[PDB]
PDB file of C-alpha atoms in Angstrom:
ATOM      1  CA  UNK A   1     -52.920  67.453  35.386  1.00 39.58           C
ATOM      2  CA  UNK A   2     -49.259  68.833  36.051  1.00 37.35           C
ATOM      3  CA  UNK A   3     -48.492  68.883  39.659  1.00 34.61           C
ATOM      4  CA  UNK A   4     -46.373  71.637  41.127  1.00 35.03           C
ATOM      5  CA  UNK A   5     -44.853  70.354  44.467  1.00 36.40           C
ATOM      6  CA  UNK A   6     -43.951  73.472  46.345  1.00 36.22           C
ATOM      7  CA  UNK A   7     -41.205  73.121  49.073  1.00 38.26           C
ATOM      8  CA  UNK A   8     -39.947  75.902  51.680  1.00 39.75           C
ATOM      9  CA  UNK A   9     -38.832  75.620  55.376  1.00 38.67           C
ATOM     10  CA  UNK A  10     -40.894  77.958  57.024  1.00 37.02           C
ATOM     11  CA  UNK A  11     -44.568  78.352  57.999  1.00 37.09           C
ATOM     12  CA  UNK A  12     -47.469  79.161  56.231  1.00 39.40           C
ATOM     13  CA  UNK A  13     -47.729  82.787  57.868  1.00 35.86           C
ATOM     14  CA  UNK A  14     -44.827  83.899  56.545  1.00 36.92           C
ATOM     15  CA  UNK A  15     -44.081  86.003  53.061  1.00 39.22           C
ATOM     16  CA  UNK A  16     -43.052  83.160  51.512  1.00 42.25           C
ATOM     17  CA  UNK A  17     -45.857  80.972  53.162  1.00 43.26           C
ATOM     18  CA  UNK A  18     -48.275  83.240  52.051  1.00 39.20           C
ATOM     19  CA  UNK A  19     -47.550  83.392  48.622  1.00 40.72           C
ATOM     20  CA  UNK A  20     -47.039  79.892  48.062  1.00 42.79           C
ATOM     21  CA  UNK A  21     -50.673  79.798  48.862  1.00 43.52           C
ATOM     22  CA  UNK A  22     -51.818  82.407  47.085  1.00 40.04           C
ATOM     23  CA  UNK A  23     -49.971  80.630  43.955  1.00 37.55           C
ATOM     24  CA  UNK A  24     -51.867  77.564  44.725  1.00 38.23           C
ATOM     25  CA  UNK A  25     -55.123  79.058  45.084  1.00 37.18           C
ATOM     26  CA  UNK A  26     -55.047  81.257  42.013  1.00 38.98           C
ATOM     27  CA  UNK A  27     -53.131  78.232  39.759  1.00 38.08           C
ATOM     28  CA  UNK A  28     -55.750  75.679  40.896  1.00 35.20           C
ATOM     29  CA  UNK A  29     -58.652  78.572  40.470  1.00 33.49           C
ATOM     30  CA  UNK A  30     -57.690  79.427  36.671  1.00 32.06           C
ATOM     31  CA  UNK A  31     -56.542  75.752  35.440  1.00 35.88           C
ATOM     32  CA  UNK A  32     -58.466  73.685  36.402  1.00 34.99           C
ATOM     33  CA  UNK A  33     -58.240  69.828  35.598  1.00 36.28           C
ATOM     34  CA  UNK A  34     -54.495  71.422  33.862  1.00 37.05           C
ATOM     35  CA  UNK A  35     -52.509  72.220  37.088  1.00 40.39           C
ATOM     36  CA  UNK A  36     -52.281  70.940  40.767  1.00 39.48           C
ATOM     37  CA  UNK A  37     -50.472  72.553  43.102  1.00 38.23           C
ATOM     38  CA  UNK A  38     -49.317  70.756  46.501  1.00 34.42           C
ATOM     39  CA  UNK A  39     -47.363  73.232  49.290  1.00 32.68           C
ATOM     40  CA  UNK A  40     -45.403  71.953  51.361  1.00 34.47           C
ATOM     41  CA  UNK A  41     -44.188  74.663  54.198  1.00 34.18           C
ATOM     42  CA  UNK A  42     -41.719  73.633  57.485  1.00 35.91           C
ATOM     43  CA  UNK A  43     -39.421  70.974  55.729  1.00 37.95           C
ATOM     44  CA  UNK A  44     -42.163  68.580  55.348  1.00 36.84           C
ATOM     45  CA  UNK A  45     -41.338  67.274  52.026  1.00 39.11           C
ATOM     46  CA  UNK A  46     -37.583  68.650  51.764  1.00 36.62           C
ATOM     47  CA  UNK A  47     -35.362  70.342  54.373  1.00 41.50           C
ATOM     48  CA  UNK A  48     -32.769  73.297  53.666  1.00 41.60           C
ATOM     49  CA  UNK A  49     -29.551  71.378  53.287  1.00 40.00           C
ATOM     50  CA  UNK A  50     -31.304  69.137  50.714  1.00 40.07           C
ATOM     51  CA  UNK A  51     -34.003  71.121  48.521  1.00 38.93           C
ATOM     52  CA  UNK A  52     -31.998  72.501  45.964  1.00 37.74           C
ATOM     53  CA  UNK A  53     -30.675  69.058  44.788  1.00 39.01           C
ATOM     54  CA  UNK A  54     -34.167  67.555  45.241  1.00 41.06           C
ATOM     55  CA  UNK A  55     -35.383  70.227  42.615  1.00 39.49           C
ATOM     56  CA  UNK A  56     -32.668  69.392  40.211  1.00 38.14           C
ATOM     57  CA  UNK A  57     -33.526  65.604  40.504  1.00 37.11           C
ATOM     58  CA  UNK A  58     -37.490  66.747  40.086  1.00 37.42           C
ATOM     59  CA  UNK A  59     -38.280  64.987  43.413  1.00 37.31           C
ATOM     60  CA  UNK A  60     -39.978  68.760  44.185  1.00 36.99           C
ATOM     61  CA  UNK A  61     -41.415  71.102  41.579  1.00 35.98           C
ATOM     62  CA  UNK A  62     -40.942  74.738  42.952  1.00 38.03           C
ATOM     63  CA  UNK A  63     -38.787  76.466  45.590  1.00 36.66           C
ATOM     64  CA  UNK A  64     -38.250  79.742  46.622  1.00 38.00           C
ATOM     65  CA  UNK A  65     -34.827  79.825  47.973  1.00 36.36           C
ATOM     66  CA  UNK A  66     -32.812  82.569  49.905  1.00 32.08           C
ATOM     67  CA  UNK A  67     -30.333  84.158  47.409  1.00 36.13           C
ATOM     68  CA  UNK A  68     -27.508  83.581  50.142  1.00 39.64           C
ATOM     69  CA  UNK A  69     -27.937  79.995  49.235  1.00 40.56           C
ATOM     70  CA  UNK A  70     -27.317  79.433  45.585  1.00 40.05           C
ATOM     71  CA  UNK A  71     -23.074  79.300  45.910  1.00 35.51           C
ATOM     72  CA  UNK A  72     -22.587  76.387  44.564  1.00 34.33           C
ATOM     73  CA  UNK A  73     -24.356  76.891  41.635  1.00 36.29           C
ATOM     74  CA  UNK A  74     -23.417  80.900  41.070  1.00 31.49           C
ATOM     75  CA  UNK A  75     -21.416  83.446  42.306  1.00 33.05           C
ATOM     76  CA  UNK A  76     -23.965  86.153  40.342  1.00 35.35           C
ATOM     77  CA  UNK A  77     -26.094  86.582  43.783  1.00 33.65           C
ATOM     78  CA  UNK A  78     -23.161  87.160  46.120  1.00 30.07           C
ATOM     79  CA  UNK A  79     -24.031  91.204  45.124  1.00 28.59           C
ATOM     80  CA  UNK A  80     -27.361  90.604  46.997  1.00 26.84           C
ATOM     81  CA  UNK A  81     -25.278  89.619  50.450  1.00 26.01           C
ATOM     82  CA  UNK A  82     -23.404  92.913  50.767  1.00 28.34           C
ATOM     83  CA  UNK A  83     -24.309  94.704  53.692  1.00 29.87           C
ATOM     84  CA  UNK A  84     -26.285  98.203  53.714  1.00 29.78           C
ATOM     85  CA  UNK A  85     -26.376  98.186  49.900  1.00 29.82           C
ATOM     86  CA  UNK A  86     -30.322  98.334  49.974  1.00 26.14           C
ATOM     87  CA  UNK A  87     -31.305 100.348  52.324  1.00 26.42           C
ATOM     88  CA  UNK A  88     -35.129  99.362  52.374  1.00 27.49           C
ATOM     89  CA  UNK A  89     -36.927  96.436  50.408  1.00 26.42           C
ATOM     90  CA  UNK A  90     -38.251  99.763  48.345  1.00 25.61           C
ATOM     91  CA  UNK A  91     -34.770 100.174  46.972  1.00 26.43           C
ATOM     92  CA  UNK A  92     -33.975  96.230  46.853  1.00 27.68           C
ATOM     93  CA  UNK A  93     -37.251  96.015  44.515  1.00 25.67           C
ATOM     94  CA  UNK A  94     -35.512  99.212  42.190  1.00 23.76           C
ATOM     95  CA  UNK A  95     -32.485  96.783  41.779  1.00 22.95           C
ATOM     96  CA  UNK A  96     -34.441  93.506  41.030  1.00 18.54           C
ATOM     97  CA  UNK A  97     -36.577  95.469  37.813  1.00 16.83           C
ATOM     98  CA  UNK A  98     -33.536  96.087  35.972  1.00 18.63           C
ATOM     99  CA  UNK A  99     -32.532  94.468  33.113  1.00 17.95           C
ATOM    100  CA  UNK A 100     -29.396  93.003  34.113  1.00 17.19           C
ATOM    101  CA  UNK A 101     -31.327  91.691  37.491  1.00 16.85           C
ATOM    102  CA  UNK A 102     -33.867  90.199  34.911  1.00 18.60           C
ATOM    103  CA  UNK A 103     -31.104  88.417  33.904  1.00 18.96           C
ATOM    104  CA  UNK A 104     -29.895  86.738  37.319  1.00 19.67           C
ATOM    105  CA  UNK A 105     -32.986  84.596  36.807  1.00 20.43           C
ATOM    106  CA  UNK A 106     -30.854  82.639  34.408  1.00 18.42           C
ATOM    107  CA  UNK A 107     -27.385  82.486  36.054  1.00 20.05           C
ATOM    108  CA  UNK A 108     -27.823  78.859  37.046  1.00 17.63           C
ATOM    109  CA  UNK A 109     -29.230  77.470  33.853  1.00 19.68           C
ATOM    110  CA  UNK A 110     -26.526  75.339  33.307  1.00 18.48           C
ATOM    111  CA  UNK A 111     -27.217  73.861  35.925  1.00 19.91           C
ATOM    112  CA  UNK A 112     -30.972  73.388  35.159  1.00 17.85           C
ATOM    113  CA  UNK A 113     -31.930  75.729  37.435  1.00 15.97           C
ATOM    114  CA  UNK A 114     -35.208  78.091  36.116  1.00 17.05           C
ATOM    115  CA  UNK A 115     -35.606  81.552  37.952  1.00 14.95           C
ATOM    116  CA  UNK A 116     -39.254  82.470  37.783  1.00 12.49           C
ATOM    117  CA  UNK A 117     -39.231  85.785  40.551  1.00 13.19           C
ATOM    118  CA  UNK A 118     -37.687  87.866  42.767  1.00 16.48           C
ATOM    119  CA  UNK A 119     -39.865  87.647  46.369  1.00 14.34           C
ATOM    120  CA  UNK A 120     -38.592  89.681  48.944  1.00 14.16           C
ATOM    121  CA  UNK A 121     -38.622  88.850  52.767  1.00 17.18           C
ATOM    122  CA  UNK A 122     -37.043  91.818  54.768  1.00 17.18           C
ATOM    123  CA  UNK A 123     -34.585  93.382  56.358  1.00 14.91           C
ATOM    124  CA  UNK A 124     -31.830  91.245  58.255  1.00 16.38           C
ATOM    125  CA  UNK A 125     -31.226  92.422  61.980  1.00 15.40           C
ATOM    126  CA  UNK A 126     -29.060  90.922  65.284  1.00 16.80           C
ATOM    127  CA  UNK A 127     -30.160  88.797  67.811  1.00 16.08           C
ATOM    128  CA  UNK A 128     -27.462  88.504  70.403  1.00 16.31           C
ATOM    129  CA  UNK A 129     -26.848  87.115  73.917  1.00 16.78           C
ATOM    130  CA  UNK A 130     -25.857  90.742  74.797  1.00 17.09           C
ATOM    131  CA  UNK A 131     -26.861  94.362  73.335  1.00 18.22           C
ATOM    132  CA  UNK A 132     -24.948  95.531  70.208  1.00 20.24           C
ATOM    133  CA  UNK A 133     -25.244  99.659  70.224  1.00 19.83           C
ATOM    134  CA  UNK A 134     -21.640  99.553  68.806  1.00 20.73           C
ATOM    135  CA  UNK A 135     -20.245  97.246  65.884  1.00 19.34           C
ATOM    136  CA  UNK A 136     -16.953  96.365  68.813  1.00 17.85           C
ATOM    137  CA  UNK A 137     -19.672  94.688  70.727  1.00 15.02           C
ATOM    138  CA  UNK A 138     -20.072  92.261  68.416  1.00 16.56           C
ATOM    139  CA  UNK A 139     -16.483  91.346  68.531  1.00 20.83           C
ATOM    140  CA  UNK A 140     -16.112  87.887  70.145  1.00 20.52           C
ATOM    141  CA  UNK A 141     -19.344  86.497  69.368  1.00 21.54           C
ATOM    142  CA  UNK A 142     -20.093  83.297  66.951  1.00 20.50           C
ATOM    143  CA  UNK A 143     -23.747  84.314  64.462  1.00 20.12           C
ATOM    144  CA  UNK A 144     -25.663  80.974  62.844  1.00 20.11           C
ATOM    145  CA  UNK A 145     -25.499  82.686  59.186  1.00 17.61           C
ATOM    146  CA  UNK A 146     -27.184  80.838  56.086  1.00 20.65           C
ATOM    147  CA  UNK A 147     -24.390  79.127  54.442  1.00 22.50           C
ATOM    148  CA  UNK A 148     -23.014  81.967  52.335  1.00 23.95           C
ATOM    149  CA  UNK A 149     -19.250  82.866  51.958  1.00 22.37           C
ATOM    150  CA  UNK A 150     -20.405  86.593  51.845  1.00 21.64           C
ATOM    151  CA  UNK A 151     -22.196  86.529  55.043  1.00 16.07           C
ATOM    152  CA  UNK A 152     -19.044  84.797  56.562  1.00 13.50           C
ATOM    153  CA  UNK A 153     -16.539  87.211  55.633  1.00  9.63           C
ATOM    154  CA  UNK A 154     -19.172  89.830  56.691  1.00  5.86           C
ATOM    155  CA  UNK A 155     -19.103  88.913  60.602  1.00  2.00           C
ATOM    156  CA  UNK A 156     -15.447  88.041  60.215  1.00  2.00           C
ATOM    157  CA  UNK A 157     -14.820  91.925  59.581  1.00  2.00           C
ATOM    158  CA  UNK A 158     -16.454  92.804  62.446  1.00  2.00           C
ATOM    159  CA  UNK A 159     -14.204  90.559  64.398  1.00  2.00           C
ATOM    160  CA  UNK A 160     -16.743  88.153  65.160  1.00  2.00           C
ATOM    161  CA  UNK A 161     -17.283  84.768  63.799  1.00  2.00           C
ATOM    162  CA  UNK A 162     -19.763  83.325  61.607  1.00  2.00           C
ATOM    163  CA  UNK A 163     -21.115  79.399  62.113  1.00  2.00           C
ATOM    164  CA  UNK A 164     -23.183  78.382  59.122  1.00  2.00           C
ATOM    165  CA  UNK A 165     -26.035  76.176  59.541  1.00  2.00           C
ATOM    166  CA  UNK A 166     -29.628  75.394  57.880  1.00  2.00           C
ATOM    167  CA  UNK A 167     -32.808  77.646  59.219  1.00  2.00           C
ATOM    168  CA  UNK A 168     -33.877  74.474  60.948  1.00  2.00           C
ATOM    169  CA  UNK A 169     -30.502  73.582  63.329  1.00  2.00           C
ATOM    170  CA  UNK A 170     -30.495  77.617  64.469  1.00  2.00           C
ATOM    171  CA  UNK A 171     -32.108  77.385  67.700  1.00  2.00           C
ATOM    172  CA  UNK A 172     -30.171  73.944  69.273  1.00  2.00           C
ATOM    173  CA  UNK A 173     -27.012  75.412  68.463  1.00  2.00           C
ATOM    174  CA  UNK A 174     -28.111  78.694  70.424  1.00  2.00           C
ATOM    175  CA  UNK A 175     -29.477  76.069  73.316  1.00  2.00           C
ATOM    176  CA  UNK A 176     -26.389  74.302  73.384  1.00  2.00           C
ATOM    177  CA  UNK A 177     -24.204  77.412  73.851  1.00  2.00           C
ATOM    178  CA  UNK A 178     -22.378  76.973  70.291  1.00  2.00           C
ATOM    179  CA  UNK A 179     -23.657  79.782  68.763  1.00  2.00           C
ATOM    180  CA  UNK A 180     -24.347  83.246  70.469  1.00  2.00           C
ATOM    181  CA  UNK A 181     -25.924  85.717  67.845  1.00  2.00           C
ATOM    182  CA  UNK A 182     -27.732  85.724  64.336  1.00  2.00           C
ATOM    183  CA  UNK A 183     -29.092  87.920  61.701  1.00  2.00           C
ATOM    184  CA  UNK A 184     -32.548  87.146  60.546  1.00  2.00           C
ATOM    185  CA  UNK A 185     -35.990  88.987  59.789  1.00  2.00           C
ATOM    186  CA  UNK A 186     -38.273  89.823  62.212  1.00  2.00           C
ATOM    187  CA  UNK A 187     -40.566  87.041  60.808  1.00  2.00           C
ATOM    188  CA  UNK A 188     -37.450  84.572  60.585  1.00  2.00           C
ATOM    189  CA  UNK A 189     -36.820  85.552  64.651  1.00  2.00           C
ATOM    190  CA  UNK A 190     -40.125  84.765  65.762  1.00  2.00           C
ATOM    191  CA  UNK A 191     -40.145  81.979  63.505  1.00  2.00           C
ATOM    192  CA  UNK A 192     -37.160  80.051  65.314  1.00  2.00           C
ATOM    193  CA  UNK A 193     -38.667  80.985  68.576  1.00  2.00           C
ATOM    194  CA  UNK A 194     -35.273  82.337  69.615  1.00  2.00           C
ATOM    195  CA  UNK A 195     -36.318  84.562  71.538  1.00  2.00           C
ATOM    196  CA  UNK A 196     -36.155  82.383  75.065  1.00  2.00           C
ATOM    197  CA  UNK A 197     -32.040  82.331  74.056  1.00  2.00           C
ATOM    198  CA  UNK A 198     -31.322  85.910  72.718  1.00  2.00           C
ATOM    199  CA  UNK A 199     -32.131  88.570  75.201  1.00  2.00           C
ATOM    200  CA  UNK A 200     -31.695  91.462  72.641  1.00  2.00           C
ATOM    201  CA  UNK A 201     -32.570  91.950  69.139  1.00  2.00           C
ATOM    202  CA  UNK A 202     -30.577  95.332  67.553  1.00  2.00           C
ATOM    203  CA  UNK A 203     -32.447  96.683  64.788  1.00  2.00           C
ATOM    204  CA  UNK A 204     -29.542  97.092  62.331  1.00  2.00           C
ATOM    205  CA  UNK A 205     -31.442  96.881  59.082  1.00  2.00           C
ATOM    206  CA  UNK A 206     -27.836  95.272  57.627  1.00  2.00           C
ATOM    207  CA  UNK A 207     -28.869  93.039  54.824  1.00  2.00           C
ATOM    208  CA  UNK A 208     -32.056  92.169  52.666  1.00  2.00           C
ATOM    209  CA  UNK A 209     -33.220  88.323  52.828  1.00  2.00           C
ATOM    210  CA  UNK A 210     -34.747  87.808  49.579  1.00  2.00           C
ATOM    211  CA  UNK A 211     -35.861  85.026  47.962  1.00  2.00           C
ATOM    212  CA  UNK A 212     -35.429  83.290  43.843  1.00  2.00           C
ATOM    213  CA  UNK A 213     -38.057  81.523  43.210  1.00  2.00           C
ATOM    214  CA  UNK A 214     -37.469  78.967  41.249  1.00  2.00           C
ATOM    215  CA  UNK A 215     -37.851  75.364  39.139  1.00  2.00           C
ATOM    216  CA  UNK A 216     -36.151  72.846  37.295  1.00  2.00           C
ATOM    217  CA  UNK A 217     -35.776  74.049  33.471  1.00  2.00           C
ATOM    218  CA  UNK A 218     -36.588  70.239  32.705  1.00  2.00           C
ATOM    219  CA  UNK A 219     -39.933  70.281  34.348  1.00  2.00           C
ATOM    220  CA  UNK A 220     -40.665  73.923  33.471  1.00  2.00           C
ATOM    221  CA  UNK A 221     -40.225  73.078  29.716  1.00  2.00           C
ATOM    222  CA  UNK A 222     -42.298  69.846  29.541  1.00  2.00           C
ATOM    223  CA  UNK A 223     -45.099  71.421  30.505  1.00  2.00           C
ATOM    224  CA  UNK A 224     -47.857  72.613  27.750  1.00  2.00           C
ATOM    225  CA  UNK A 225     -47.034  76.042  25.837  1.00  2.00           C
ATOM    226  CA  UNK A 226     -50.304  77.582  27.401  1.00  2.00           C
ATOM    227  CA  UNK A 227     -50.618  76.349  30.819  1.00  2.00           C
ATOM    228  CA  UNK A 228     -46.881  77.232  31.293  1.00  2.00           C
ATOM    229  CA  UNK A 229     -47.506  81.065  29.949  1.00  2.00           C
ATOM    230  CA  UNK A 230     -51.048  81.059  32.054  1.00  2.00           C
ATOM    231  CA  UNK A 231     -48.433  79.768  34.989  1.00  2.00           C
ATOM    232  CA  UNK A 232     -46.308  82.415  34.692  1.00  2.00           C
ATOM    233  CA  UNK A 233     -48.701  85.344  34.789  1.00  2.00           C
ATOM    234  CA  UNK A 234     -49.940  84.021  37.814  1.00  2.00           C
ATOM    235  CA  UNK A 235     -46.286  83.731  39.307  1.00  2.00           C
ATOM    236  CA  UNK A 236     -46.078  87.760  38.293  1.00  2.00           C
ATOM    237  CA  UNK A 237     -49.100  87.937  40.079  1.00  2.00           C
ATOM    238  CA  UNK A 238     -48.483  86.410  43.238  1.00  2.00           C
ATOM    239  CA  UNK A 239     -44.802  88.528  43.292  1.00  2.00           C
ATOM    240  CA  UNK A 240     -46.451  91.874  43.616  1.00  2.00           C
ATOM    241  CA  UNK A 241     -48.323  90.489  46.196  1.00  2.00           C
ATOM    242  CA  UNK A 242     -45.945  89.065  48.477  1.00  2.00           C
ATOM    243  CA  UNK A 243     -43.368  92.011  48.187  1.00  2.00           C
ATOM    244  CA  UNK A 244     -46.320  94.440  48.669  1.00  2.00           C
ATOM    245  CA  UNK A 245     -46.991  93.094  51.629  1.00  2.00           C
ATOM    246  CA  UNK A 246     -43.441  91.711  53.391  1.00  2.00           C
ATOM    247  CA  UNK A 247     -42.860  94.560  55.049  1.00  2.00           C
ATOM    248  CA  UNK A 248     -45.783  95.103  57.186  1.00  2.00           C
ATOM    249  CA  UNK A 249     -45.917  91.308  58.027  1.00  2.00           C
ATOM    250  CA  UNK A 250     -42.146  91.871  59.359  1.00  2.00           C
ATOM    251  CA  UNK A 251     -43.647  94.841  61.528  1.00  2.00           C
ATOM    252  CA  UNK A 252     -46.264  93.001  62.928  1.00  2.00           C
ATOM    253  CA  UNK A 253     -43.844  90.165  63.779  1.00  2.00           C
ATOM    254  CA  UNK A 254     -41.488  92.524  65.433  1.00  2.00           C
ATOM    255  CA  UNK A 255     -44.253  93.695  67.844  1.00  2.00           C
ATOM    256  CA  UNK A 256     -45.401  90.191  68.549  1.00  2.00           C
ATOM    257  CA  UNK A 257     -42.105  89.059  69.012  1.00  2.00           C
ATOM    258  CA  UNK A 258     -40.847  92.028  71.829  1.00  2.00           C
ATOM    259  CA  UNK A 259     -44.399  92.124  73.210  1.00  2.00           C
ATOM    260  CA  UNK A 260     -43.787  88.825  73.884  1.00  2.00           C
ATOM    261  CA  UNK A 261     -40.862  90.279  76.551  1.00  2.00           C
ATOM    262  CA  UNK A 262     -37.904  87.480  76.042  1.00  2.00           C
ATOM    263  CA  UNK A 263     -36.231  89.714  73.611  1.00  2.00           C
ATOM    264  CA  UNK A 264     -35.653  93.388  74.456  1.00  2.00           C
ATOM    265  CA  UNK A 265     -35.515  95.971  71.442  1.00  2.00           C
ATOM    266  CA  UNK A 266     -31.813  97.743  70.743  1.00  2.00           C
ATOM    267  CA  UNK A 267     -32.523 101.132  68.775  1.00  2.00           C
ATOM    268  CA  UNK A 268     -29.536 102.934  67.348  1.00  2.00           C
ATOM    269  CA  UNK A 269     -29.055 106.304  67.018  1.00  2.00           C
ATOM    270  CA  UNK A 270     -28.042 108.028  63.667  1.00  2.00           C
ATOM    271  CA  UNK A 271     -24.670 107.761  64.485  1.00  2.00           C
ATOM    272  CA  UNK A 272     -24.438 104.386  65.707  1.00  2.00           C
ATOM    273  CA  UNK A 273     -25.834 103.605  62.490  1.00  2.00           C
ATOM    274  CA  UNK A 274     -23.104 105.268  60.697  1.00  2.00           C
ATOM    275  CA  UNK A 275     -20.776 102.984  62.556  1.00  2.00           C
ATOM    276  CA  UNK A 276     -22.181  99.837  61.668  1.00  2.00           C
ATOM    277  CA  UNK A 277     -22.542 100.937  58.195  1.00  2.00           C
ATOM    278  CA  UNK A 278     -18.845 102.518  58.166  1.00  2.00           C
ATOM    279  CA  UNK A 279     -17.859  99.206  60.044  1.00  2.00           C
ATOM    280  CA  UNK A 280     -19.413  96.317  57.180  1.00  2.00           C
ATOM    281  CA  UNK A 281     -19.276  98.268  53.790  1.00  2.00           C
ATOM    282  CA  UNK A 282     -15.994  97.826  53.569  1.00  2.00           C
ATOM    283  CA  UNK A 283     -17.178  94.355  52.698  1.00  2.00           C
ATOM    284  CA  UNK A 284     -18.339  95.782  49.438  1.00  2.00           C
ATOM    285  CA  UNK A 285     -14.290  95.983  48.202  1.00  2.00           C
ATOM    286  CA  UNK A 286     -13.666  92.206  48.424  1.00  2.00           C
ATOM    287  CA  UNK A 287     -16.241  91.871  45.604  1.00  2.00           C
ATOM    288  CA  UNK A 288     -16.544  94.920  43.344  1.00  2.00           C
ATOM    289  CA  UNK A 289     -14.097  93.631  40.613  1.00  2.00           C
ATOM    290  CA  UNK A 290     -16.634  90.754  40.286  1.00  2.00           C
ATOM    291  CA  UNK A 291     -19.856  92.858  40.144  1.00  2.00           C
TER     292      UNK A 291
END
């Protein structure tokens, strides 16, 4: 029986929870006594910082790691960073099916890195100790961003500053006073249970969080012809599922989360929209050449 160790740092009600499930229940349904599937959800068996390595050295089987996070082993992703280029997970999806996205799945192969999907989270708003209607009100401010160059020089533009740090160390940094903002999903915000420390949440819609999921190409090629194929219809499978469905669970967490009443909702107009949009897509130029 090949075991599949499945590692992520969130919970089990998450997208990414979810489907890690669902891939154990349908692998362990449909090969039998051939596959075993262990998940492992909040950092119990590996932690953010340390995953990716742990996957190389086949101490873990299966991640699925934010896209933001794969730096040191690509600069191919950094496209998936940019601010307002997708303006929905409907049009992120459009970008992942083509052929040249297809392709991504394979930019870290020389590192023995194995992209099996594309799952999709949400969209990326602010949580701040103060109300951001205008992109000048985020001037001043220091965001806990995932640990992506992109995402740094995104909050730099806007005259912030960005302090990067794993999903885990988010909230003590915002208890200790060393970090005033972020940029998460609405499932990501509840999540953290930062809520208690950020007394507004702007809907900005500024980035996608999406996830690779992904394995060692060593472990992914030792195992059987069949099984392997079988594995990877199932890992089809479970994609459609969990970016079917990411979107509503982020709308449910977003009512959850402000019903809750720590956080108050920030709406923006149309044309406070614009100006965020006007204000961060100038990112876009620092990395065009490259993409």
């Amino acid at each position: 029986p090949v075991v599949i160790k499945f590692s992520h740092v969130v919970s089990d009600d998450t997208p990414k929870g979810k489907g890690a499930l669902l891939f154990k229940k349908l692998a362990e349904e449909r090969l039998p006594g051939k596959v075993k599937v262990e998940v492992y959800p909040n950092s119990t068996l590996f932690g953010d910082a340390d995953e990716i390595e742990a996957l190389r050295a086949n101490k873990v089987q299966m991640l699925a790691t934010s896209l933001s996070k794969f730096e040191p082993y690509t600069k191919q992703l950094q496209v998936f960073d940019l601010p307002f280029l997708f303006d929905d997970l409907e049009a992120l999806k459009r970008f992942q099916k083509r052929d040249k996205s297809r392709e991504l799945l394979r930019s870290m192969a020389k590192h023995g890195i194995y992209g099996l999907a594309y799952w999709n989270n949400g969209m990326k708003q602010l949580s701040a100790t103060r109300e951001l209607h205008r992109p000048d009100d985020a001037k001043g401010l220091v965001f806990r961003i995932q640990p992506s160059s992109v995402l740094e020089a995104q909050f730099a533009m806007l005259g912030a500053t960005a302090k990067q740090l794993s999903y885990a160390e988010t909230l003590k940094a915002m208890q200790a006073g060393s970090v005033q903002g972020t940029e998460n999903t609405w499932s990501n915000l509840a999540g953290q249970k930062i809520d208690s420390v950020q007394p507004y949440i702007t809907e900005t819609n500024h980035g996608a969080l999406s996830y690779m999921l992904i394995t060692s190409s060593a472990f992914w090629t030792g195992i059987p012809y069949q099984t392997r194929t079988e594995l990877e219809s199932i890992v089809d499978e479970v994609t459609l599922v969990v970016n079917k469905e990411a979107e509503a669970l982020n709308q449910k967490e977003r009512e959850h989360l402000l019903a809750a009443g720590k956080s108050r909702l920030v709406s923006l107009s149309a044309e406070e929209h614009e100006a965020w949009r006007n204000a961060m897509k100038p990112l876009w130029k620092n990395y065009e050449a490259q993409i």
